[PDB]
Design an enzyme around this catalytic site. Structure first.
Site, PDB file in Angstrom:
ATOM      1  N   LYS A   1       0.732  -0.773  -0.011  1.00  0.00           N
ATOM      2  CA  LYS A   1       0.106  -0.424  -0.154  1.00  0.00           C
ATOM      3  C   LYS A   1       0.990   0.879   0.085  1.00  0.00           C
ATOM      4  CE  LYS A   1      -4.616  -1.320   1.657  1.00  0.00           C
ATOM      5  NZ  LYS A   1      -5.566  -0.831   2.430  1.00  0.00           N
TER       6      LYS A   1
ATOM      7  N   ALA B   1       8.281 -14.234   7.343  1.00  0.00           N
ATOM      8  CA  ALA B   1       7.324 -15.568   7.196  1.00  0.00           C
ATOM      9  C   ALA B   1       7.407 -16.193   5.965  1.00  0.00           C
ATOM     10  CB  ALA B   1       6.019 -14.474   7.477  1.00  0.00           C
TER      11      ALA B   1
ATOM     12  N   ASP C   1      -8.761  -4.156  12.847  1.00  0.00           N
ATOM     13  CA  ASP C   1      -8.115  -4.510  11.522  1.00  0.00           C
ATOM     14  C   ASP C   1      -7.818  -5.927  11.716  1.00  0.00           C
ATOM     15  OD1 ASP C   1     -10.379  -2.370   9.770  1.00  0.00           O
ATOM     16  OD2 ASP C   1     -10.859  -3.840  10.138  1.00  0.00           O
TER      17      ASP C   1
ATOM     18  N   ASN D   1      -2.950  -9.559   5.984  1.00  0.00           N
ATOM     19  CA  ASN D   1      -1.971  -9.632   7.401  1.00  0.00           C
ATOM     20  C   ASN D   1      -1.840 -11.030   7.985  1.00  0.00           C
ATOM     21  OD1 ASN D   1      -4.310  -7.511   7.200  1.00  0.00           O
ATOM     22  ND2 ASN D   1      -3.059  -7.911   9.517  1.00  0.00           N
TER      23      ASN D   1
ATOM     24  N   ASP E   1       0.139  -6.441  11.870  1.00  0.00           N
ATOM     25  CA  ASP E   1      -0.339  -5.370  11.804  1.00  0.00           C
ATOM     26  C   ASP E   1       0.235  -4.490  10.763  1.00  0.00           C
ATOM     27  OD1 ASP E   1      -2.116  -3.431  12.151  1.00  0.00           O
ATOM     28  OD2 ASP E   1      -1.719  -3.680  14.548  1.00  0.00           O
TER      29      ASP E   1
HETATM   30  C1  LIG Z   1       3.426 -17.070  -5.319  1.00  0.00           C
HETATM   31  O1  LIG Z   1       3.513 -16.301  -4.487  1.00  0.00           O
HETATM   32  C2  LIG Z   1       5.427 -16.642  -4.107  1.00  0.00           C
HETATM   33  C3  LIG Z   1       4.952 -16.563  -2.718  1.00  0.00           C
HETATM   34  O2  LIG Z   1       5.569 -15.121  -2.205  1.00  0.00           O
HETATM   35  C4  LIG Z   1       5.416 -14.526  -0.592  1.00  0.00           C
HETATM   36  C5  LIG Z   1       5.245 -13.671   0.240  1.00  0.00           C
HETATM   37  C6  LIG Z   1       5.485 -13.435   0.686  1.00  0.00           C
HETATM   38  C7  LIG Z   1       5.894 -13.801   1.634  1.00  0.00           C
HETATM   39  N1  LIG Z   1       6.332 -13.617   3.395  1.00  0.00           N
HETATM   40  C8  LIG Z   1       6.675 -12.634   3.888  1.00  0.00           C
HETATM   41  N2  LIG Z   1       6.931 -12.283   5.102  1.00  0.00           N
HETATM   42  C9  LIG Z   1       7.446 -11.180   6.336  1.00  0.00           C
HETATM   43  C10 LIG Z   1       6.504 -10.123   5.582  1.00  0.00           C
HETATM   44 CL1  LIG Z   1       6.654  -8.141   6.260  1.00  0.00          CL
HETATM   45  C11 LIG Z   1       5.467 -10.337   4.270  1.00  0.00           C
HETATM   46  N3  LIG Z   1       4.445  -9.227   3.594  1.00  0.00           N
HETATM   47  C12 LIG Z   1       3.845  -9.456   3.176  1.00  0.00           C
HETATM   48  C13 LIG Z   1       3.394  -8.893   1.361  1.00  0.00           C
HETATM   49  C14 LIG Z   1       2.594  -7.742   2.133  1.00  0.00           C
HETATM   50  N4  LIG Z   1       5.636 -11.435   3.384  1.00  0.00           N
HETATM   51  C15 LIG Z   1       6.555 -15.673   1.009  1.00  0.00           C
HETATM   52  C16 LIG Z   1       6.589 -15.426   0.366  1.00  0.00           C
END
Ligand SMILES: COCCOc1ccc(Nc2ncc(Cl)c(NC3CC3)n2)cc1
Length: 250
Positions: free
Chosen positions: A18, A88, A131, A136, A149
């Site tokens: 965002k 994550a 929210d 998230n 958050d």
């Molecule tokens: C087919 O698609 C491939 C998957 O792609 C991924 C996208 C996101 C994560 N983990 C992730 N970890 C920490 C944070 Cl802080 C975060 N932030 C999310 C974006 C707000 N996202 C792992 C893999």
């Protein structure tokens, strides 16, 4: 101890969010892998969220939990603000929810169990979420949950107390917990409308139905978690303990 952008290697982008984005990253000395959030001053100081930023940063900063995404530190550069987050490794819960139809009973229940521990604990740090939604909710490398958050956003998630004009004490999170435990099991939040306008009308009066494929056990939990008057909603102890919960919560 504080930090700087040069300390990190700005790898591939994780989500096109965002206020800016979020990228994979690693601290050079430590070789520690994490997620980094680049968000600009010229972004937040231009809707007004300038203060409400440095606000919830600290709200989060002192906080630590296994179903809560840690923040490891924060800082600013020439233009922008930076958030040093947990990583994550299994993306959004949304990512999973879309790619499947809905969640099987066992899985939903564990996701709720975890969200309780994390809110039940979080209610004792005198912090409430408003929210919490699955844009998230993130998954750790072991596949389990991690909270991170007139015109604002979709409000399928905020309780009737948040839009009638009433008071909102610490049983907000029970509404949200119901709404989600629904979404996880059904596919859509139970107050979906194509105008904000019905969505409003449909929350205030608690208007939803369950498909055939929902156990009376779920309908039982969801039903007594979705109550117009916050009073009649259970403490999070009754929840973790609820029959349908601990039947299939892995
Ligand atoms: C087919 O698609 C491939 C998957 O792609 C991924 C996208 C996101 C994560 N983990 C992730 N970890 C920490 C944070 Cl802080 C975060 N932030 C999310 C974006 C707000 N996202 C792992 C893999």
């Amino acid at each position: 101890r504080q930090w700087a952008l040069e300390d990190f290697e700005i790898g591939r982008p994780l989500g096109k969010g965002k206020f800016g984005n979020v990228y994979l990253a690693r601290e050079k000395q430590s070789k520690f892998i994490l997620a980094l959030k680049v968000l600009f001053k010229a972004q937040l100081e231009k809707a007004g969220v300038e203060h409400q930023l440095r606000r919830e940063v600290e709200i989060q900063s002192h906080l630590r939990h296994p179903n809560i995404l840690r923040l490891y530190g924060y800082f600013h550069d020439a233009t922008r603000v930076y958030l040093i987050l947990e990583y994550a490794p299994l993306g959004t819960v949304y990512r999973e929810l879309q790619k499947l139809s809905k969640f099987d009973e066992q899985r939903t229940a564990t996701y709720i169990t975890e969200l309780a521990n994390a809110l039940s604990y979080c209610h004792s740090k005198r912090v409430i979420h408003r929210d919490i939604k699955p844009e998230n909710l993130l998954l750790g490398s072991a596949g389990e949950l991690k909270i991170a958050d007139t015109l604002s956003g979709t409000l399928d998630y905020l309780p009737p107390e948040m839009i009638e004009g009433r008071m909102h004490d610490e049983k907000v999170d029970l509404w949200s917990l119901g709404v989600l435990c629904y979404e996880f099991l059904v596919g859509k939040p139970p107050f979906e409308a194509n105008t904000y306008q019905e969505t409003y009308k449909r929350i205030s009066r608690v208007e939803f139905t369950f498909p055939d494929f929902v156990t009376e056990g779920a309908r039982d939990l969801i039903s007594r978690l979705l109550k117009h008057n916050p009073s009649q909603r259970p403490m999070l102890r009754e929840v973790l303990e609820h029959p349908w919960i601990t039947a299939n919560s892995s």
